[PDB]
From a paper:
The eukaryotic replisome, organized around the Cdc45-MCM-GINS (CMG) helicase, orchestrates chromosome replication. MCM is a two-tiered ring composed of six related subunits (Mcm2–7), with one tier of amino-terminal domains (N tier) and a second tier of carboxy-terminal AAA+ domains that power ATP-dependent DNA unwinding (C tier). CMG travels in an N tier-first orientation (Douglas et al., 2018, Georgescu et al., 2017), unwinding DNA by translocating 3ʹ→5ʹ along the leading-strand template, which is threaded through the central channel of MCM while the lagging-strand template is excluded (Fu et al., 2011). Multiple factors associate directly with CMG, including Ctf4 and the heterotrimeric fork protection complex (Csm3/Tof1 and Mrc1), which has important roles including aiding normal replication rates and stabilizing stalled forks.
To assemble complexes for cryo-EM, we incubated S. cerevisiae CMG with fork DNA, Ctf4, Csm3/Tof1, Mrc1, and the non-hydrolyzable ATP analog adenylyl-imidodiphosphate (AMP-PNP). Overall, the complex displays a “horseshoe-like” configuration, with the discoidal Ctf4 trimer sitting across the GINS-Cdc45 interface whereas Csm3/Tof1 are located on the N tier face of MCM. Two turns of double-stranded DNA (dsDNA) protrude from the N tier of the MCM central channel, tilted from the vertical axis of the channel toward Csm3/Tof1, where it contacts both proteins. The trimer is rigidly bound, sitting side-on across the interface between Cdc45 and the GINS subunit Psf2, with the helical domains facing away from the replication fork (left). Tof1 (13–781) forms a right-handed α solenoid with a crescent-like architecture that mimics the curvature of the MCM ring, traversing the N tier face above Mcm2, 6, 4, and 7. Being located at the front of the replisome enables Csm3/Tof1 to “grip” the parental DNA duplex via a network of interactions with the phosphate backbone and both the major and minor grooves. Multiple structural features contact DNA in the vicinity of the fork junction, several of which require extensive remodeling from their positions in the MCM double hexamer (Abid Ali et al., 2017, Li et al., 2015, Noguchi et al., 2017). This remodeling enables the N-terminal hairpins (NTHs) of Mcm6 and Mcm4 to engage the lagging-strand template ahead of strand separation, where they help guide the incoming dsDNA onto the NTH of Mcm7, which appears to function as a separation pin, splitting the two strands of the incoming duplex. We observe two major conformations for the MCM C tier (termed conformations 1 and 2) where the whole C tier swings beneath the N tier, with some inter-subunit motion between adjacent C tier AAA+ domains. In Mcm3, the equivalent basic residue is absent whereas an arginine (R455) replaces the aromatic/hydrophobic residue.
Author numbering:
A (entry chain 2): 173 to 710, 738 to 868
B (entry chain 6): 612 to 615, 620 to 712
C (entry chain X): 13 to 37, 43 to 106, 117 to 274, 280 to 305, 329 to 405, 412 to 550, 556 to 606, 657 to 781
D (entry chain 5): 20 to 107, 131 to 198, 205 to 213, 235 to 305, 320 to 517
E (entry chain 6): 255 to 306
The structure:
Amino acid sequence: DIDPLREELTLESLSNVKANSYSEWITQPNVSRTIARELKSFLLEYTDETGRSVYGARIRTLGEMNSESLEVNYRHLAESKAILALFLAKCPEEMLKIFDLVAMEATELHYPDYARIHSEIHVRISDFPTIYSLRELRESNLSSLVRVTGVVTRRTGVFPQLKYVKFNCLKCGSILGPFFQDSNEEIRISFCTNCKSKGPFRVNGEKTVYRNYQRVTLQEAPGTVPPGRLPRHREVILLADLVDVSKPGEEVEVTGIYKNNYDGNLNAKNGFPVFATIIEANSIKRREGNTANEGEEGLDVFSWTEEEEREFRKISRDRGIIDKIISSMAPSIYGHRDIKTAVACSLFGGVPKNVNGKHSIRGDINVLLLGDPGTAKSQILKYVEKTAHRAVFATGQGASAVGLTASVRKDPITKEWTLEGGALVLADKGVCLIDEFDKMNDQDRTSIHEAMEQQSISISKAGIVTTLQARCSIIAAANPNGGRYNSTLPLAQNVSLTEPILSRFDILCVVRDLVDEEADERLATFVVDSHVRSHPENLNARQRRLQRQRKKEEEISPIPQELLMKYIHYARTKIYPKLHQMDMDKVSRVYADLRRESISTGSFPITVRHLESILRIAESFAKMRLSEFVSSYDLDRAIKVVVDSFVDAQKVSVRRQLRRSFAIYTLGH
Amino acid sequence: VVRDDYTIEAGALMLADNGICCIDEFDKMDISDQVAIHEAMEQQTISIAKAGIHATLNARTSILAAANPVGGRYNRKLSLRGNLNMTAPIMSRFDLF
Amino acid sequence: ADFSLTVLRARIALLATAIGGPDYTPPYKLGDDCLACLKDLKRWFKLVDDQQKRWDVAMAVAEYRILTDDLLPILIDWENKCSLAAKLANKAYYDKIALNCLQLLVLMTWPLIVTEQSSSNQITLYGELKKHQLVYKKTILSMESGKVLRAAIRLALDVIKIDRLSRTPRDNMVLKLVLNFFRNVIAIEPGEFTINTKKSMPKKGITSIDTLPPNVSMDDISLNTVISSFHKNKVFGFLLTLTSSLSDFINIPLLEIMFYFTKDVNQELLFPRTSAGFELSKLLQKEHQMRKNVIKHTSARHSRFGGLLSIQTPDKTRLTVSGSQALVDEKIALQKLDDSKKWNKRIIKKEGLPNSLLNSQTGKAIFFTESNGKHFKEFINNFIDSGFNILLHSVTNYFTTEQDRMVTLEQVEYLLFFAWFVKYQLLRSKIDNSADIKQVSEALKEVTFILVSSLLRSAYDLKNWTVTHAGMIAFNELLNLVSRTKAAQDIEFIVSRLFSDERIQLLSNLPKIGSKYSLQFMKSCIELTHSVLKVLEQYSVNFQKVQANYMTEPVIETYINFLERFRELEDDSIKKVFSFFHRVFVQAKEQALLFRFDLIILLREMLSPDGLDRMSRSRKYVSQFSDYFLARLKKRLKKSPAWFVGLLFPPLHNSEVGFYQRYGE
Amino acid sequence: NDDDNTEIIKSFKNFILEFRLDSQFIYRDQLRNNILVKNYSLTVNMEHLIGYNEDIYKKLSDEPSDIIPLFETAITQVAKRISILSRASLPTFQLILNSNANQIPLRDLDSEHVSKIVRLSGIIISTSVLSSRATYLSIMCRNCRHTTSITINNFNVSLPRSCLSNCGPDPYIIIHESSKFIDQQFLKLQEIPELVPVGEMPRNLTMTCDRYLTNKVIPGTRVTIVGIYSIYNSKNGVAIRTPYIKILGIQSDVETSSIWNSVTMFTEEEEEEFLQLSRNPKLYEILTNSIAPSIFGNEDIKKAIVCLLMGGSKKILPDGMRLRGDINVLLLGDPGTAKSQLLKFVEKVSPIAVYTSGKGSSAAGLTASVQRDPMTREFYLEGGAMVLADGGVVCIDEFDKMRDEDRVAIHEAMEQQTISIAKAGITTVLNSRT
Amino acid sequence: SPEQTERVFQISFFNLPTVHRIRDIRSEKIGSLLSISGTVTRTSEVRPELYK
DNA sequence: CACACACTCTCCAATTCTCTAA
DNA sequence: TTAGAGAATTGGAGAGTGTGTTTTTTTTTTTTTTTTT
Ligand SMILES: Nc1ncnc2c1ncn2[C@@H]1O[C@H](COP(=O)(O)OP(=O)(O)NP(=O)(O)O)[C@@H](O)[C@H]1O
Ligand SMILES: Nc1ncnc2c1ncn2[C@@H]1O[C@H](COP(=O)(O)OP(=O)(O)NP(=O)(O)O)[C@@H](O)[C@H]1O
Ligand SMILES: [Mg+2]
Ligand SMILES: [Mg+2]
Ligand SMILES: [Zn+2]
Ligand SMILES: [Zn+2]
């Protein structure tokens, strides 16, 4: 009594392939129905290690965001109904074509009529278990799913591409059948149903539907490219909801379908029957974080789950959360709590302000690590590159005026001018880290002056006249004149910089590597223990390695590093603290004292941009407590940071007088 | 950085990644060119921001440097720190002399 | 209609998954209700392909791999389950599903034919279904190395164990089933290509003939793999015991098998008459001599060098020819002047049966490995010494009764089987002396001579050439046998007396029509005629009168047309032709019958350095014949100048002039 | 189908003739007032179209490219009725739209919007020369010499493949003498700086306007557009085609005057506010405190920035000698003194201005640069910051960090008010009075 | 398992009696097995030939 | 556009096939 | 059995249709990086 064309199989039965290819098996109607029900049952019945329905939590977020794309983790298929994980790797172009319909029905169970919001859902497969460089791809990958790493090197505009097309025949019918269009090659039809002979056509205008299209040239990552040998590339194609996901110069990781097609230009110039190859992208991830890490799944390492936001809210009300977070900045670097304090403030930032639309104030905190050799100035900066959301690193003679900032490119083909963004654009809403800042050329170093305060880059070159945004915090590391700090001199004589750039930095840290027989025991003990703990030879393995990684990390740090990375991004994106105005007498007397004692000739350039700094730093401490309001304890911690950093920059001949004069502000916390 | 789009041309410290870069005439090297190795000696990476090509590159290289005193003769009246035009930032990078 | 096709595919795919699977605990497990699924699939084959002549079920059972993924594993596991028990010496249930698996193997492997009576849907699928049959043969021969052929002989042993008398017809049926299974696995053979000719050719021809599926090589299907898998699975020992145990029901399947794997083996490879390196070397020296002749015809400078010749001719007028080679060689100049002509006269050029010695190229040879070649020759030597004599005696009775029912396929597989075995066993007894000739003594018995001669006569009279060709082959072999036994020593005289009037006229007419048919037909007529004339000469009704029945222009025409193919002939066949021309010239003094121009061109084209090899035994007697021919031609021309036109044209029949032309008073 | 178009047309004639608020027939009156001064267009505010009959707005917004050109003919039929005596001609009227639909950010335009009326905003970075599109082709056959014509409306037609009445496969030539044409202009619009996503280059659209919307803007102006987001099949991927906007209504935000020969574009309700303000006895106190109100002190710098925003007076002598009327000011000083915050303020108060950094600048990028056009392969001249800022203020921050070769290019443009060029066979003196 | 294809075999001859230079190349040796010594200036992507 | 090449379509007569009487 | 008259199929003339073709490419300005100035 069942319809013979409708009848179905079992999970036992799918493995017994009985067709000449997976392509031919997956497309048979009874097989297709069985696959759909299995994939449906995976999304409905799978639950987390904690026992929550993770794909319910993903579907909630899908329909609330009105997102068209559902993230699915490949490990969750390898851990349950694993033949589906196998077919998905072997022939994704047919398997995803079913799993997109199953995902539509899985979300429509939750949100009836979501069809009126999007007609279709796309599955963004994540954490695919094997990875290739672009050099390692071979013909045996064709039509299979790949995961691949590279630098997105060109990224064309976003265009409407035709998706469903009817055709007009010139001879007869305005209705040739609706071809779904393949994103690789022309329609090539050679026939008409309304007239059974060859003839001309026009693409029909009664109905069509469009999808967004964008190519991306993806090249090998220069740290995996063997030196002196050329980087390889591939064309990548991004379709609807994947367009505009990555910016030129990011290290990107793609999952997608490796495909090939005939084109005559290859066959013409190469003289062999050779086919061009294209990765149709199915998901994209950006290779931020430390990357030598198993504990960090998903397409976005700085996303949080609801059980993670609730954990941030819990710890944010720990008494002493600021001093726990500060102790967790570079937890394997001993001492330097003033640098860790300055790094914490710069890494959370203040609040940017606009006043009636007329005027604006800088919210980012800039930091100068000035000091002696072998003192973790460069290790502190390399830690902030792992820890910050968007970050860029640059060094001395390796950084130019317009490799920072921005430059104008001339195309070789269309051969008119365009902008390429520098390090202060690619770190926008983020940090730029400038190692050996004293050893930059003055012509290169003075490119930063606009991006410090106005947080913009105003180019007028080659008839391009415009302004980019450049809201970075800048952290810089430098050595004094002669390579060593000389404590009897004023700051303006210890350094080759000048007042306009020294005043743009709004925390200064001076590091003196003085000999002491007990601090050098405490430091040497910590460094010896840090080598033994970090040694590369010191309930299944993919989980079992995480209990030892957690053991070793929590010896050093008050807070897990994975939690602190997400806690910082959360505090930067959600929290924007306001001021109660009870500060007026403290901050005004601090500024008046700091200005009056700055009559000394070579002293630090305390300026109105250094009153304004106390207000930024107070907002950064309120962000660390995850508060929407600055307290008087944040105003005291900020005045202590700014007064201590001013007093530590003075010559030993007046440091006693200044510690004695400022005691009500230095001893305030 | 090479053009005509910009790209990376590998240098002596990258071509020796996971091996030894041997540098002769070291004291006769211009100090403006000497300072370029301070990241590659210690942080073992070269990082770049020029035109349209920001980058970070491996330089996991041991350095062996040969030098002459300023004046040719090792002035035996002086500690090593005075015979040689090097400053504390690079003098502290070499493990032993 | 197309809904019916996709519902049929869906129903058969759901039956195909219902049979069983690897179990994954791999050891294939029977599905519950497997017998009912097998019986239902047999019902599907019958109740569609018999009832509606469609082939659609037989096509779609290959799509879902039922043979290679279910029927083969089921038979091979059941074979192991019975082998183990025999070495220990519900099995009554598993018998029924083993039998029904063999039943479906025979249905799926059954030979395909296309005919006038063929369906519009069968002719559509024919060329495709031959590919799936090629995959079935590869899989049957290689899947666990022919263990399924071992399972087939086991199902035959199950009925060989019970007596020749006390057996039931429902078991003699199983014997015929197993024999039909082997003939099918043998006679899966790669298909014909076919083109629609309603629309004329483009500026290239048929750019590939290659009728093979994506994962089959030509070697996976060859008799080498067949012989290998038969010897490893003791199939030959089964066939040999079976063909000896004949002391009616099965004789015709058994002859069919012996035809289907003797057909394309030219026997001479079975007798050789560092060795492979010496053989390679001699052939490279012949190709070197050919390339030396091509180099002697090629430009000593580049293609563009441009030298241009003018040839003065009678009537004191010019032609022109390009190329440095033409300047020095007058013969090359005239050859080039003919080569460039843009005219060609239109040529004229010429059924359900397998490719065989009737149809395959004269040069074709199948390359046995050295173990395969010894395993084959030892099998057929045992078969000849045991069972050929009784097997031929049995089927020649069954077909002397019942002649009119033999559709052309039975008629060929009888005639060719008779000829091939008698030729092989004559040749074995030529080289080996311990081979008896008289082991095939049945071939000359009066009942078989009468059958072969009747059958050829009826095929000639009904104009069925494929059967007349097969008749001519078998008659040529019977004549070889008669001549051999006469030389060895009254049955010779009985057959030799039996053709005196009418078969003489038939065998004289055969070469007169020969010029209208394929090279293999002309070859057979020439080998037959050589043998006949050698017999009648040895016996002496009147040699002069009977050979004068052959000395007529139409025979000389087919001899010239066979000799035009000489670049692909062998020295044996050229020696047969020139023996006949020597017979016409010297023994008859007929010589005017051969003076026509077609022979003069053909002698030059083969006596040329570009023609026959100079070191060939074949060239020596052509050179000798040509010297005698030109002497008699010079004499005739000096005596009668009109012969320059008479040599250009066919001969006359106006009486007085026709006699004078032929003999010179 | 032409029964259906006749009902759509009849329903919009009745919108013009019946739509009234208070005593006044505001679209009949606007048509007549536009006919007399000879602009053949109507501006329609879409809240009024929704108020009259929402089914018409539904029709219009479902498929604009097929309904806009039906409302243009409905406007012409009313334009004849209200301005010519029957039984005793006008061109095809333009329809211009005003809207308060939500602005779509320029980067959020995607396949969901193709063929829809879309309102957005941006900075005009470029304007082309005018080009001629046809609105009426006169037509004649090559072979039989039959003659006819093709009315054209410029949304999403070509020469007929058949003679209309062997006459041939492509029979028609255009009679240029009897054809009629309209102006078309291309703009390019960048998105607004405060709407660019983090770390991206500001995105760009090309777009087209025609008739009375041409010349209504200049490079650097901030505009809001209403238009049809649409596609064209450029020859410059697969099954892919380029997006653009058919502009239906430019609306410049501050009444920044566009291409403008000082003409009297002000209105009496603001001119009488200015003519009272001029006569306030405290006016220079009011304007001084209105400069950068969040910057404390610097009173003389504010007083001088007020002088710079007015300038002096330009003079032209009977000698032919030209006197500079523009005032130039240098803020030379210590760090953190509000020099750059005052430059970022004068960029916003001045009706035309450009902020730039001397370190981010070139001689060519400041004055004018010679480009090479990739199609003609000819050189052509493009204006830099001094030409973009012409008639206004250029703010040059970090003027001490400008290269000595780049600072010198400014010497002519600060005194003689020109940019002289002699490059690639171009030579000109461009005006630049800043 | 699915069906797995025909395997293609790369026969790799080596250790020839003699080596030719790029300047020794002559069309007379077309279709014959040589060995060639040289230095690589460039290498292309690894691309798929349509073989069968 | 117009003029060569590439390629298909269609008709006509030239040749060979088949049957009959001399 | 030859030979000659009438029937069928194939070759190719030639008419018809359809497609591509010009073609360049340095020069002159503007920029951004290395190094040799
Ligand atoms: N306080 C510290 N605690 C632990 N390790 C340290 C400390 N100070 C320095 N080190 C280690 O010693 C090395 C020197 O740090 P590094 O960041 O390279 O020095 P630096 O301060 O930037 N000096 P320099 O490059 O010469 O200006 C690194 O391997 C650090 O890990
Ligand atoms: N007088 C002031 N009144 C109000 N805010 C001020 C004042 N002076 C300085 N500031 C603020 O402090 C910062 C000064 O930076 P900026 O205006 O860029 O300094 P600048 O004069 O251009 N100095 P510089 O670029 O170093 O030569 C801005 O955020 C100002 O709003
Ligand atoms: Mg360092
Ligand atoms: Mg400033
Ligand atoms: Zn059609
Ligand atoms: Zn006409």
